[PDB]
């Protein structure tokens, strides 16, 4: 059975207080995965679900705030001498999973102190994302790589990845590394860095994940009597912004091109994710809700990571075409939100069938239903778990 199986996952995965992305691969833990299987390991043990987290901030986060998207421990963890991380991070959605483990946690003395000991560290990456990656007080934040996006070959990028200067067990890097080689000639400074990349990109993911974390931060800070000065700040900009990225011509939330100044025309899973941060109006979700609807005419199982009907979709090639069960899940919450429960309804459906026939996959094809990359992958086991308490 599922749950059975995504326990196994989880705790073949685990190595202390945190938990790799897949099996096979070495011990090294990952900002987004964790924060995912975090949410997994409520269902198999509170403390370890707390540890999951206390273990990425305290082995990961530097005096500047930023999270990076990877601490290569290189070894097990107890639960709670500075491991080397990544230079760059990816989506924020830690704050909201810290909320939800603050409230349903059933002991309310551990719950107390670990997000009294959460809080300002969450605040502090919060921080650094704006300071850094908007000086200009927009209300949206910038990637500077594609890896930060958390999907990597988004179609979306193309363009953009085009313009620069020259994980997984189963065997574009030039130009990956080219950044990576300026950020280091830049001795990662920020400012020069937000200056100078030639990849700078306003995701709609990244940023509808930031402004949901945003909103759940706020409502942690209030819970726990903290000042949620600036929390505000980013919550009402964050609101402006998100929602200058929808395209009315095209009826969908597209990335922004901030080097070349213009929004990025392709339709992927990411333009659903405001859903999920709670902007749109009802109108704005019934016609995303009718572009879902569009995209399951030509795929079996919903929610194909780019529009099926796109010339860039591939059934099973990473993030242009393949469906993902952490992106299922966040947009059929978001659609739950708006009353859109059949289309929820249909998403977790696919998701669990998926994961029934095929185990817990990185990702599977939208035409066959087959699975794809990383076996034993952790957070389709853990949000099978979560998904189904």
Excluded at 111 to 129: M, N
Aim: glycine share 8%; hydrophobic share 40%.
């Amino acid at each position: 059975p599922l749950r059975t199986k995504a326990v196994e996952v989880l705790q073949r995965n685990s190595r202390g207080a945190f938990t790799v992305p897949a099996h096979g691969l070495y011990p090294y833990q990952w900002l987004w995965d964790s924060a995912f299987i975090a949410l997994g390991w409520t269902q198999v043990d509170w403390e370890r679900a707390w540890q999951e987290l206390l273990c990425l901030f305290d082995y990961g986060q530097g005096p500047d705030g930023m999270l990076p998207h990877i601490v290569f421990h290189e070894q097990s963890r107890d639960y709670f001498a500075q491991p080397a991380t990544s230079g760059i991070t990816q989506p924020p959605v830690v704050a909201t999973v810290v909320r939800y483990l603050y409230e349903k946690d059933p002991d309310r003395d551990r719950a107390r102190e670990r997000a009294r000991y959460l809080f300002p560290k969450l605040l502090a990456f919060h921080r650094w994302l704006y300071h850094a990656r908007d000086p200009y007080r927009t209300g949206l934040v910038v990637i500077v790589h594609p890896w930060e996006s958390g999907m990597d070959n988004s179609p979306a990028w193309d363009k953009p990845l085009s313009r620069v200067p020259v994980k997984h067990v189963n065997p574009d890097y030039d130009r990956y590394l080219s950044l990576l080689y300026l950020f280091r000639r830049l001795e990662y400074d920020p400012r020069e860095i937000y200056r100078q990349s030639p990849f700078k990109v306003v995701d709609v993911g990244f940023n509808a994940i930031l402004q949901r974390a945003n909103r759940d931060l706020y409502a942690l800070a209030v819970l726990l009597q903290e000042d949620p000065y600036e929390i505000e700040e980013w919550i009402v900009r964050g609101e402006v912004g998100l929602e200058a990225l929808w395209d009315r011509e095209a009826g969908f939330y597209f990335s922004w091109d901030l080097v070349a100044g213009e929004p990025i025309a392709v339709k992927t899973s990411a333009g659903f994710l405001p859903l999920f941060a709670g902007t749109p109006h009802q109108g704005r979700a019934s016609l995303l809700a009718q572009e879902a609807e569009r995209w399951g005419e030509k795929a079996r199982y919903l929610l194909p990571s780019v529009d099926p009907t796109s010339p860039f979709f591939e059934p099973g090639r990473y993030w242009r075409g393949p469906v993902w069960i952490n992106v299922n899940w966040m947009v059929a919450e978001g659609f739950r939100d708006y009353g859109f429960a059949a289309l929820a309804a249909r998403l977790k459906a696919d998701a669990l069938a998926l994961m029934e026939r095929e185990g817990f996959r990185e990702y599977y094809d939208p035409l066959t239903g087959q699975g794809r990359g990383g076996e034993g992958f952790s957070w389709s086991a853990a949000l099978a778990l979560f998904w189904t308490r």
